[PDB]
Amino acid sequence: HPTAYLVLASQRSGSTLLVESLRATGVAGEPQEFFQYLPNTSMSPQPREWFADVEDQSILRLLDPLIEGKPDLAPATIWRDYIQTVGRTPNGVWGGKLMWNQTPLLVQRAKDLPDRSGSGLLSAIRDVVGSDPVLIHIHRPDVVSQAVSFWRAVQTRVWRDARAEYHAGAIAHVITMLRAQEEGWRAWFTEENVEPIDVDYPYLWRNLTEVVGTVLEALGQDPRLAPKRSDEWVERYRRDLPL
Amino acid sequence: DHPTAYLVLASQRSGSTLLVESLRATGVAGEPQEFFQYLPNTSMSPQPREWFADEDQSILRLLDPLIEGKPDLAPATIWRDYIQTVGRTPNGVWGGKLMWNQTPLLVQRAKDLPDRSGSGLLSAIRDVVGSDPVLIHIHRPDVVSQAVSFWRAVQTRVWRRAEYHAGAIAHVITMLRAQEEGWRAWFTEENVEPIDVDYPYLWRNLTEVVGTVLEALGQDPRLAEWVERYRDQRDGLPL
Numbered sequence: 361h362p363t364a365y366l367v368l369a370s371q372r373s374g375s376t377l378l379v380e381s382l383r384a385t386g387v388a389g390e391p392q393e394f395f396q397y398l399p400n401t402s403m404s405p406q407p408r409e410w411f412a413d414v415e416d417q418s419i420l421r422l423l424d425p426l427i428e429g430k431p432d433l434a435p436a437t438i439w440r441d442y443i444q445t446v447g448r449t450p451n452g453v454w455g456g457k458l459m460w461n462q463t464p465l466l467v468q469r470a471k472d473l474p475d476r477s478g479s480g481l482l483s484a485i486r487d488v489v490g491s492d493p494v495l496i497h498i499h500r501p502d503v504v505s506q507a508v509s510f511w512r513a514v515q516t517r518v519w520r521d522a523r524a525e526y527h528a529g530a531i532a533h534v535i536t537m538l539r540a541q542e543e544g545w546r547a548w549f550t551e552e553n554v555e556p557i558d559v560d561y562p563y564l565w566r567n568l569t570e571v572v573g574t575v576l577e578a579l580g581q582d583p584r585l586a587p588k589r590s591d592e593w594v595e596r597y598r599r600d601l602p603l
Numbered sequence: 604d605h606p607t608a609y610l611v612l613a614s615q616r617s618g619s620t621l622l623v624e625s626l627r628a629t630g631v632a633g634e635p636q637e638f639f640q641y642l643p644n645t646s647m648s649p650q651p652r653e654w655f656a657d658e659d660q661s662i663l664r665l666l667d668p669l670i671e672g673k674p675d676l677a678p679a680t681i682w683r684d685y686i687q688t689v690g691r692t693p694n695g696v697w698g699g700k701l702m703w704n705q706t707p708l709l710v711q712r713a714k715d716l717p718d719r720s721g722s723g724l725l726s727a728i729r730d731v732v733g734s735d736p737v738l739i740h741i742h743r744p745d746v747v748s749q750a751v752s753f754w755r756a757v758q759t760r761v762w763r764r765a766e767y768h769a770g771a772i773a774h775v776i777t778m779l780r781a782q783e784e785g786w787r788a789w790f791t792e793e794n795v796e797p798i799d800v801d802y803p804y805l806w807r808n809l810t811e812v813v814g815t816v817l818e819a820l821g822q823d824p825r826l827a828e829w830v831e832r833y834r835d836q837r838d839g840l841p842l
C-alpha cells in the first residue's frame with residue numbers, strides 16, 4: 361500500500377487539474393513542484409532562463425529581466441525533510457508534481473544524502489520521497505496548444521493579459537523543448553522499467569472524477585472523495601519550423 | 604505600490620481553507636500553505652492524541668494513536684527561506700495561513716533570525732514573510748458547527764468513519780473559543796485592523812472576498828450534522 365504519489369509531467373500539460381483536484385480531497389497530500397527551484401537562485405526558472413540560448417532580441421524583450429536570487433544552502437537531508445513534511449496530509453500521504461526539466465536537479469540534490477540508495481532518477485525519487493510513490497503521467501498530444509499556453513504564461517508570469525505577444529521563433533523554441541521532455545520521460549520509463557499510471561489530458565479533462573478516484577484508490581483512499589475561447593496563435597503558428 | 608504578501612489569520616475549519624484555495628487557483632496569489640503548523644519534535648501537524656492532551660479514556664479511544672515523525676533540524680534562516688520561496692508565485696506574490704494556536708511556534712521559531720526586527724508576533728510575521736502582509740481574518744461565528752467539523756476531522760484525519768461524543772466537543776468548542784479570543788485581543792494589542800470576512804459571507808459570496816484580496820495585492824478582481832445532536836439541552840456543556 362503506497363503512501364505517496366508523484367505526478368510526472370510537463371509545464372501546462374494538465375497535471376494541475378488532476379493534482380489540485382487531488383489536494384481538495386484532503387487525503388492526497390499537498391502536491392507542489394517541490395523540485396522546480398534552481399539551486400543558484402532558489403527560484404523557479406525565470407523567463408529569460410527558459411530562453412537562455414535565444415539571442416533573438418525581439419523575443420528577449422518580451423520577457424522580464426532576471427532577478428538574481430541566492431544559493432539554496434540547505435543540506436541535502438534538510439532539503440529532503442522539509443519536502444517530506446510540507447507535502448504530506450495529516451493522514452500521512454504525500455504528493456507532488458515533477459516536470460521532466462527538473463529531473464537532473466533532483467538527482468543532483470539527492471547525490472549527497474546519506475544512504476542514497478542508487479545513483480539514478482528512480483532511487484532519487486525513492487530516497488527523497490522516503491517511499492515508493494505511485495507514479496502518474498499526464499501528457500498532451502497537441503504540443504502547439506501547449507507551447508502556446510506556455511509562451512503566453514512565461515510573458516505574463518501566470519501559469520494558471522495585455523502584454524502577451526505572438527512570436528513564431530519562440531513558440532518553435534518552446535515546442536522543440538516540450539517535445540524533448542517527452543522523449544525524456546519516454547526514454548526513462550523504458551530505461552528503468554517503469555509503468556506509470558499513464559493518462560493524457562483529453563481523457564483527463566473528460567473523466568476527472570474517474571482518475572481522481574483511481575489515484576485515490578491506489579493510495580488506499582475511498583474513491584468516494586473525488587469531486588465533480590480559441591487560440592489564434594495555434595492556428596497562426598501552424599501556417600508559419602517544428603511541431 | 605503593491606503589498607506583495609498576505610496572511611489569512613484564522614482557526615481550524617473556518618472559511619480559512621476555502622478562501623485560500625480559491626486564491627491559489629488564481630495563479631497570482633502564491634501557494635498559501637499552513638507553513639506555521641508543524642511541530643518541532645515531530646515535524647508534522649498536531650495529531651489527535653496531541654490536541655486532546657488535558658484526562659478521559661472516553662476520547663483517547665476515538666483518537667488514532669501518536670505517530671512520532673522526526674526532529675525539525677532546519678536552522679531558522681533556511682526555514683524562512685523555504686517558506687518564502689514555496690509560498691510565492693512567479694509574479695512574486697506570497698500567500699499563507701496562520702492560526703492562533705500556531706502563533707507561539709512562529710515566534711519561538713523567529714527568535715533565531717539574524718535580523719530580528721522586534722520581539723512580538725507582528726514583527727515575527729514581517730521578518731518571516733520578508734514584507735508587510737495584507738491581513739485577512741476569517742471567522743465562522745457559529746462555534747457549534749465549527750467545533751463539529753473539527754471533531755469529525757480530528758478523528759477522520761480528513762480536514763476538508765467515526766462518531767459524535769459530547770464531552771470532547773466541549774474541549775473543542777472552548778479551545779476554539781480561547782483561540783478566537785487571542786486574535787481579537789491581538790488585533791488591538793498591536794493595533795492591527797485586518798480585513799474581516801465571515802464564513803456565511805464566504806460560503807455564499809466568496810467571489811467578492813477573493814476579488815477583494817486580489818485588489819489589495821494589486822492584481823485583477825476579474826481573475827478568480829450532529830449539530831442539533833449537540834444543540835446537550837441537559838448537561839451544561841459550554842456553547
Ligand SMILES: OC[C@H]1O[C@H](O[C@H]2O[C@H](CO)[C@@H](O)[C@H](O)[C@H]2O)[C@H](O)[C@@H](O)[C@@H]1O
Binds near residue numbers: 390620637649702
Ligand atoms: O492538526 C491537524 C492539522 O489539520 C488542519 O489542516 C490540514 O488540512 C489542510 C488540507 O486539507 C492543510 O492545509 C493542512 O496541511 C493540514 O494540516 C489544520 O488546518 C491545522 O491547523 C492542523 O495542523
Ligand SMILES: OC[C@H]1O[C@H](O[C@H]2O[C@H](CO)[C@@H](O)[C@H](O)[C@H]2O)[C@H](O)[C@@H](O)[C@@H]1O
Binds near residue numbers: 459520630692
Ligand atoms: O516557469 C516557472 C515555473 O512556472 C510554472 O509553475 C508555476 O505555476 C503554478 C502556478 O499556480 C505553480 O503551481 C508553481 O508554483 C509555479 O512555479 C511551471 O509549472 C514550472 O515548472 C516552473 O517552475
